[PDB]
Structures are given as structure tokens and as C-alpha cells.
Amino acid sequence: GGLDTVYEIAAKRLAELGDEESLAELEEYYKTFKKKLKEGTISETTAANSLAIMATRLLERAREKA
Amino acid sequence: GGLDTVYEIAAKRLAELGDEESLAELEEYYKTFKKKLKEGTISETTAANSLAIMATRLLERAREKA
Amino acid sequence: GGLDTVYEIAAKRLAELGDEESLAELEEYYKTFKKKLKEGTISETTAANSLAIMATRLLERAREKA
């Protein structure tokens, strides 16, 4: 639930800002975190935190380059 | 009320820094987080954490502008 | 426990780095979270997590100033 929600919020906003490269980067990080979360080698909190942090800087980059 | 508490801390500090646009960004994220919690696709703790992460970046930007 | 531990680690580092303003900001955030947790308006996970978010940003600012 939470990881998907963070990812969806970030992806919707990155698409609105028109940043294809940030969208692809975000998808890569999300997929990686979904695999690490699959194996139980990462808590849900850690996955959500890390995805939110890079999605935050990617969103900052989107607001500038626009 | 964790999400509300994080939101209040961030909004108070952004208002202190005189950054109205960051205040509007923060509220937009806060409204989105509530709709999501409302739909049950995210937990209160995760929503609060993610809002705090984005708010931390907003506080950095708001300070640079001051 | 966890909130105190995060706070103490960050405060020790901020003092080592000589950043009085970041130390005071961190203390303000910690006191706010202690009050909010007393009042039951924030989860323990959110308080510790958010203090870690802000403390990492404060440490970045401290190493940049130093």
C-alpha cells in the first residue's frame, strides 16, 4: 500500500511536470525497492523512506527544469 | 493525528520563513495524503513520514529564499 | 529509547561539527516531538523517523558550514 502510494504520487507529479528521465529513474528505484521488499531484507518503512527521499529530489529537479 | 502533527510543524516553520508557495505545495501534499489514507491505500505512519520528507526539502528551499 | 538515541547521536555530531544553530534547531524539533508523543498526536515511529530526516539535513548543513 504505502510504497505504491508514494510511487504513484511521485509519478503523477513527474508526468505533470513533463520529466521523462525522472519518471524512468523513479520507476527503476521503485522496482528495485519492490524486489528488496520481496525478500524481507528491507522493512516497509525503509523502502518507503528511501523511495520518498529520491522521489523528493527528483520532484525538486522537475520543478526547476520546468 | 500524526499526519496533522507533521503538517502543522512544517507549516508553522514555512510560514516563519515567509514562503507562501512552499506552504501551498505542502498543503497540496497533505490533502493528497488524507485522500489516500481515506481510501486505505496508505497508513498514518507512512503518510506522516512521507510528508515529513517532502516538508524537509520544502524547508530547505524556503530557507534559501529567505 | 529510539527518539532519544537518534537525537543524542545527531546532537553529539552537530556539537563536534561546531554548528550551534543546527544544534538549537535539532533541540527544538526533539522537544516538539517529545511533547507531541506525550499528547499522543504522533506515533513513536513517525517521531523517530522524522527526527532522523531533519537531523540528516541538519548534519548536511553542519558539514557544509564546517
Place this chain on the structure above:
Amino acid sequence: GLDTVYEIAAKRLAELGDEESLAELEEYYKTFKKKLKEGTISETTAANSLAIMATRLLERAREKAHH
């Protein structure tokens, strides 16, 4: 959890060529381990906090990655 966070972060930071991020991460990991043995923090919270700091270390490692 704490060991896993530390090992993942150390692998990535070593790949990126940041000896200084590796040293900072090791310091944090060791501190978290003293706090755990002294029982003033739980393993889950310690792992989460180490992951947060490691994410910042990784962002900076990638910042030297290019320019």
C-alpha cells in the same frame, strides 16, 4: 535488519568509489550497535535510521559519481 541495511549501503557506496561515505556509514553502524547492546534502541528503529543516513550518503556518493 541493521546488518542488512549496512551491507546493502556499503556495497553500493563501495561501487560508487566513496571511501569517505563508507567510513561515515561504518561509524554510524558501530554507534547503532553500541546503542542496541545497551538496549536504548530497537533493531528495527536502528535499521530505519541507518537506512536514512545511508540514503543521504548514497546521494552524495552519486554526486561525486559524475561531477
